[PDB]
């Protein structure tokens, strides 16, 4: 451990925070300040319209879609007292989920996944949350998230979310993320069902490529889901003063959910390995059949050619004047040995 | 004391004594020139390129008050980069690289640095280094290098070496892009060998870059009396640069492993294809030459007279059986 400082970079001025991503098509800010009685929501683009809600009596939810504009991120972090290294972590995308507990806020890094049925690619969007005393700050890369049910609960007064503080808002966001992971695993179920129905009767190299792609996706999901278990454990077992003594059982429930998700991921990886093994066994069996045909034809015919060669030389002194002309006896011997070899093959159950 | 490696012995000594007001430089080839430079308060940079000749390095070893174990380490070139802190100096082991694009070869060269008060030692093994920018900075007073002590010179040498690693990463990035383009589409028998060479080079890179990060960490984390606290942020910056290098190397190794895997898959299809070819060719021919041998025998009774010109009948039945097996192999989707 050591003191937190803005890490230096080569070919880059010290004060620059760089968005480590590839989504640069959109930007907006969602604000949902809700009390137990009334709530007001809006969408803006000016940064300064959301700064007043830092010292908010009631919980407020700020959703800054689009971090490619680092200016808004830096301004919000400066106004909310966020550490510069935390802002660097927000803009950095190529990193694993984590939390860092500070004096005034907790900083959670999370991942969102979307599965495409065309060519079977898995895409990861990093989402980060900051739980201050009276607000939740959420940053996203691009438009399109999974917290729509939480928004519906906030707007329609379904549940206890309006009667609770920002810690319940954080819990609801994490729960929505876990539900998204469950739906993603269902989609992987559908993909594995398709792969099963294809591999058994249509084996080829494209099936190998698809199987390896699915295995890579499973590896990525495990690598990103294990730190989710770590982070939920650290949330409900190392509770800071920001998180109330209550709502801890909700964090425990989410931890149980992520344990279930990790176990499901492991079983999925085992199943895809089994599919690969089935394909290997099938191609090996085809190789067996080809080997069997080749060795059977060789076993049947090579003795025949060899004996034809033995009696096909020219020495001018051979017992070639025998009863029944000899040559028919040679053919009878060859037929007998050929049918003997065929009978041995039939006894060993080849062809 | 013996030299482990294989490079040519070219014993050349460079001396660069500099101060804030003015510097002084001379290039000689005698050992005695660098002995009297342990007293000047002005920082002095001492180079000994030809480490192969153990006589000069031994004279340095007893004159500079260092244990012969570090002399053995200096001569030992097959050594990972490690740093040693001692009561009177610091010994740092580093590695210099040179990637030839033509042969796709990643060569290495161990250079060791010893920092005594008011002087810096440095031992190459081949002609040519990458610390020329530091030489120009000292010569033309381009920076604050002449306003600072020898710890700043050690920092500058390490930083220039890190920049050399950055240039190496640029070259290897170009090569990885080209090789990925060649592997993903239009494979060939040479691309697999190129990919293996790239993987070996990346393994050497990581094995030489992780100890460098550890050396920088152990360098700035603790401050021995030889080093001042002024250079600690500078060494922190160098440590961050090594973090960048390590992350890039890891990503490159992952990419190369993916390219290896995509080729490694689907070999059983090739085995099935070569089986198909061999079995089809060897099946429609062994019976044919068998019949040829039967009719090529030397028995006297065999009927070989007229019979609709003779050989036409055997040719006809031979073609019949050939097309029979051809039609059979048309089944099972072999042909």
């Amino acid at each position, epitope marked *: 451990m050591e003191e937190k400082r803005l890490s230096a*970079k*080569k*070919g*880059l*001025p*010290p*004060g*620059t925070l*760089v*968005y*480590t*991503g*590839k989504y*640069r*098509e959109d930007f907006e800010i969602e604000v949902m300040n809700y009390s137990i009685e009334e709530f007001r929501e809006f969408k803006t683009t*000016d940064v300064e319209s959301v700064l007043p809600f830092r010292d908010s009596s009631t919980p407020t939810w700020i959703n800054i879609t689009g971090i490619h504009r*680092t*200016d808004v991120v*830096q301004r919000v972090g400066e106004f909310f007292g966020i550490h510069p290294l935390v802002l660097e972590d927000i803009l950095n995308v190529h990193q694993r989920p984590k939390v860092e507990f500070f004096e005034n806020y907790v900083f959670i890094v999370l991942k969102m996944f979307t599965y495409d049925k065309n060519l079977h690619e898995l895409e990861s969007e990093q989402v980060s949350l900051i739980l201050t005393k009276n607000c939740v700050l959420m940053f996203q890369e691009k438009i399109g998230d999974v917290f729509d049910p939480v928004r519906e609960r906030i707007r329609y007064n379904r549940g206890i979310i309006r009667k609770k503080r920002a810690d319940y808002l954080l819990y609801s966001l994490i729960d929505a993320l876990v539900d998204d992971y469950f739906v993603l695993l269902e989609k992987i179920d559908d993909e594995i069902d398709v792969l099963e129905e294809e591999v058994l009767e249509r084996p080829e190299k494209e099936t190998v490529q698809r199987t390896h792609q699915l295995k890579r996706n499973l590896v990525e999901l495990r690598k990103t889901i294990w730190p989710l278990r770590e982070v939920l454990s650290s949330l409900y077992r190392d509770v800071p003063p920001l998180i109330e003594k209550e709502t801890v059982p909700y964090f425990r429930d989410v931890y149980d959910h992520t344990i279930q998700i990790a176990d499901t991921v492991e079983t999925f990886r085992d199943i895809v390995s089994g599919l690969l093994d089935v394909y290997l066994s099938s191609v090996s069996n085809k190789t067996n059949e080809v080997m069997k045909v080749l060795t059977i034809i060789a076993t049947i015919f090579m003795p025949l050619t060899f004996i034809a060669g033995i009696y096909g030389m020219n020495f001018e002194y051979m017992p070639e004047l025998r009863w029944k002309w000899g040559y028919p006896v040679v053919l009878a011997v060859m037929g007998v040995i050929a049918v003997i070899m065929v009978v041995y093959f039939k006894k060993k159950k080849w062809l | 004391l013996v030299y482990t490696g294989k490079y040519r012995e070219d014993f050349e000594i460079e001396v660069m004594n500099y101060s804030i007001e003015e510097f002084r430089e001379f290039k000689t080839t005698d050992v005695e020139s660098v002995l009297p430079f342990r007293d000047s308060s002005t920082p002095t940079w001492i180079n000994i390129t030809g480490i192969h000749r153990t006589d000069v390095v031994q004279r340095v070893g007893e004159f500079f008050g260092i244990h012969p174990l570090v002399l053995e380490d200096i001569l030992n070139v097959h050594q990972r980069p490690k740093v040693e802190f001692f009561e009177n100096y610091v010994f740092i082991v580093l590695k210099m690289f040179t990637y030839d694009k033509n042969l796709h070869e990643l060569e290495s060269e161990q250079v060791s640095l010893i920092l005594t008060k008011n002087c810096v030692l440095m031992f190459q093994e081949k002609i040519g280094d990458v610390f020329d920018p530091v030489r120009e900075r000292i010569r033309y007073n381009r920076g604050i290098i002449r306003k600072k002590r020898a710890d700043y010179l050690l920092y500058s040498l390490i930083d220039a070496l890190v920049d050399d690693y*950055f*240039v190496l*990463l*640029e*070259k290897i*990035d*170009d090569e990885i*892009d*080209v090789l990925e*383009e060649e592997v993903l589409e239009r494979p060939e028998k040479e691309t697999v060998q190129r990919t293996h060479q790239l993987k070996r080079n990346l393994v050497e890179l990581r094995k030489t870059i992780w100890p460098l990060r550890e050396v920088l960490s152990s360098l700035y984390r603790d401050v021995p009396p030889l080093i001042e606290k002024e250079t600690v942020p500078y060494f922190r910056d160098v440590y961050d640069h090594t973090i*960048q*290098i390590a*992350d*890039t190397v890891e*990503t490159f190794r992952d990419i190369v492993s993916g390219l290896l895997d995509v080729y490694l898959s689907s070999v059983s299809n090739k085995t099935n294809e070569v089986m198909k070819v061999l079995t089809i060719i060897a099946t429609i021919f062994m019976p044919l030459t068998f019949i040829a041998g039967i009719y090529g025998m030397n028995f006297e009774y065999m009927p070989e007279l007229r019979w609709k010109w003779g050989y036409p009948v055997v040719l006809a039945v031979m073609g019949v059986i050939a097309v029979i097996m051809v039609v059979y192999f048309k089944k099972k989707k072999w042909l």
Partner: antibody
Amino acid sequence: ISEVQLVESGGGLVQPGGSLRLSCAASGFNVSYYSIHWVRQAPGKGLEWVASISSSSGSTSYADSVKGRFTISADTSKNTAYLQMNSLRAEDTAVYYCARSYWYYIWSYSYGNAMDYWGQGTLVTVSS
Amino acid sequence: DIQMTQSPSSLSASVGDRVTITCRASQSVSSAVAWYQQKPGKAPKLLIYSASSLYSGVPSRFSGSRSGTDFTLTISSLQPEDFATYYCQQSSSSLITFGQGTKVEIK
């Protein structure tokens, strides 16, 4: 608020060896969080890069052809960058574009920037 | 420094055709190459950045590629408003340089 716009003014006729400063007014963004570039284009010539400035760190960088003469600076309060030209030779008669660039990520070691918005160009001519 | 060589320096093609403009780097630039276009009398406009990525707010007909130190801008289909001058630019180093340009006119 409003749209991003880079505005350049102050470029015009000058005798050889005469020093004139170019100011790059910026609207729609804060100059502190971005890097402001200057780009020069002679009549019937390609684009050429001349200078750069990092306001949030005071880091400057100049092209070799103009290094030592041109000096770049940008005060945060006025939200405007300045490029002071002196000893302006006859070969420098051109039109000056002021731009704004953002950093993007390729690999851990490698960074590159691209210029979103340009101005309109001040025609700095040198004659007599 | 680092130099780009953009060829051809003047191109002629008709609307609906396919245009391929390639510029090579004197040394390594790790995909830190961006493409621009400038109609005469107006400031340049960004088209492609990072040598592959299409900018936000430009037509999808434009494309960019990288092959070692070779960078190609390809237009799937020309348009009457696409007849301008195209440039290269490297930004790997702190000193960024432009290609000499490539004009396009009708044929």
